[model samples]
Target: THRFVQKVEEMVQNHMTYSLQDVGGDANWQLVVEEGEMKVYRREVEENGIVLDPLKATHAVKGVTGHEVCNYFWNVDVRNDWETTIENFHVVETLADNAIIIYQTHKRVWPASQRDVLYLSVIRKIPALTENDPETWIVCNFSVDHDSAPLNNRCVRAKINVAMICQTLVSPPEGNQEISRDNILCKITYVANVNPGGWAPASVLRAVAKREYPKFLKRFTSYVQEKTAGKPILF
Candidate 1:
């Protein structure tokens, strides 16, 4: 059966952007943000008080998580099924001190034209951590089919920056504490230019994933391993 195709033709036209903010009495925080092309996927892989190994530790981030895999097999999961043809998919692990991972996939169909484009993004939130509202978040500014190849391959590029700022509510209670009197703020900025072609041909997908995936995975794995040393089914 032929599937409906969504074309990404205009420059930065077929996209979604939004920001999220959290503010309240520490515990009563709320998050507000706009939706985008990306959707959140979650899974819980714990039974009784025992933690699963190998699968949860290694495979969950790459494909569907443990619980989701079961549901996908039993039910007709349409969340991931779209009009576009997905050729290949993989996980780009992050190196944050958290269990963060980015799942990237390649689609054969172009947004508007017959051009193929890579769909990629990072997943910042994990189920194990406290669901505190993010202080701030920004969807990168993007342009679709901004650049084209001689063979008519379409490319979408975006310049995105993510920043976080927090005001400490209390001073260090002990002497020689490393607390500062200023508000805690962190800003991370980077440029990602992703194209439809694969890495074998040295396209944007190959370039960006190769350049950034390792760095991100290292930081993410280290953070999660350190924080969840004794905690089971967390991170």
Candidate 2:
């Protein structure tokens, strides 16, 4: 249990420093989806004949702040409202105000059985290093084993490592103190590496991932915009 705590920090640092461009550049990451400011790329990776593609996506949305984006993404209370794939989820334990353990079950897709994941979800604030750089925020979710939620026969145990990093870009460079949503834009980088348990067709798995990620990201950003439109911006 204690190891999981340390593992979370390690994973956070890995995500923070990870760069797809440095790994292999365009030769490795294949652009799967592109719509306006949103672009999704994936690396076709397999282990033991199992598909474990890693995905990286970037998007910019107007009328939202980085803090707000990470806050909503990290908040479990509002998760069901925006997450379309989750069948159900509950908190197993709270490690701190910024971290917790979650067990979530995803709806079954045809040809593949229902899948569940147990992971640690953490949110952190990254202060600006330079005067010109804006503050950034990140919410990371990675698979972990929990005694509270062991593998069950009803669902396949899937593992996922995902992160959402956001930074707010203010227009005019010198925006007003009373900033409106119009003056703020949130830039987001999302990364995910999932190992769907059991042997499912590699082709089917890739297809599902491609379809779901774009849809999930689009809906989530729209949901945040809707929920925060009437609310105050958080820096």
Candidate 3:
């Protein structure tokens, strides 16, 4: 009885679009990593001049396809295989072909209380012009409070509103030979606001995020590659 509405579809379009912009300007964005050909940029914003700063990271890998990356992320079955910081994860529900709601309890970060999330997400790929045309993929997740699954007593449910966008560009004039990781460029812009619901030291949360996301991306890419090494299920 669950299905997607126009609101989520609209979000899919906006996030897949290259013109999507964050609230602030690029002046405060700081470079986080540039190892090899990979590039990662990050910035934290405090909208109401508050304690918690919503974290954002933009990472790019030159030799992978966006479809593989997006597929790896949306498939809840393989989350524990790649997610570095999750202590527990459960797929609470799947609303539609491209949407699912999940629950996660993150490993405690010492001082800050253990955090969890009840989130709903939608992931999908847009129509492409040609096999050579750039492919667009998107995933959006947000904290949800519905009768089906309320915030449990195990841990405080943190608020999260995030969108991940992947743009893949192909190269080397290969016509319909079924592109399989030959010469492809995939860039990901991961925008998130995973505020620690309760309280956390400013430096602690930001520093933790700064350290966590880079490692997260690297591991995620490696996992996707390993999983797709010889498979044709690049769905």
* TM-score winner: 2
Clashing pairs in 2: none
Off by over 4 Å in 1: 1-143, 148-176, 179-235
TM-scores vs. true structure, each candidate: 0.21, 0.92, 0.83
TM for candidate 3 is 0.83
> RMSD for each model, in Å, please?
18.9, 2.1, 3.3
Per-residue lDDT tens digits for candidate 3, residues 1-235, read 3644566766666555533565345777666666654455655555442345545566666556778788788888788888878898788877888888888889988787788988888877777789756667877887776676676776766888788778877665567666656666777788776666766777777778878877887888878778777766343
Backbone N/Cα/C clashes per model: 17, 0, 0
Better of 1 and 3 by lDDT: 3
lDDT assessment of candidate 3: 0.72
Which candidate leads in lDDT? 2
What lDDT tens digits, residue by residue, belong to model 2 across residues 67-177? 999989999999988898989999999988899999999989888889999999999887889997767699999888888999899999999899999988977645445
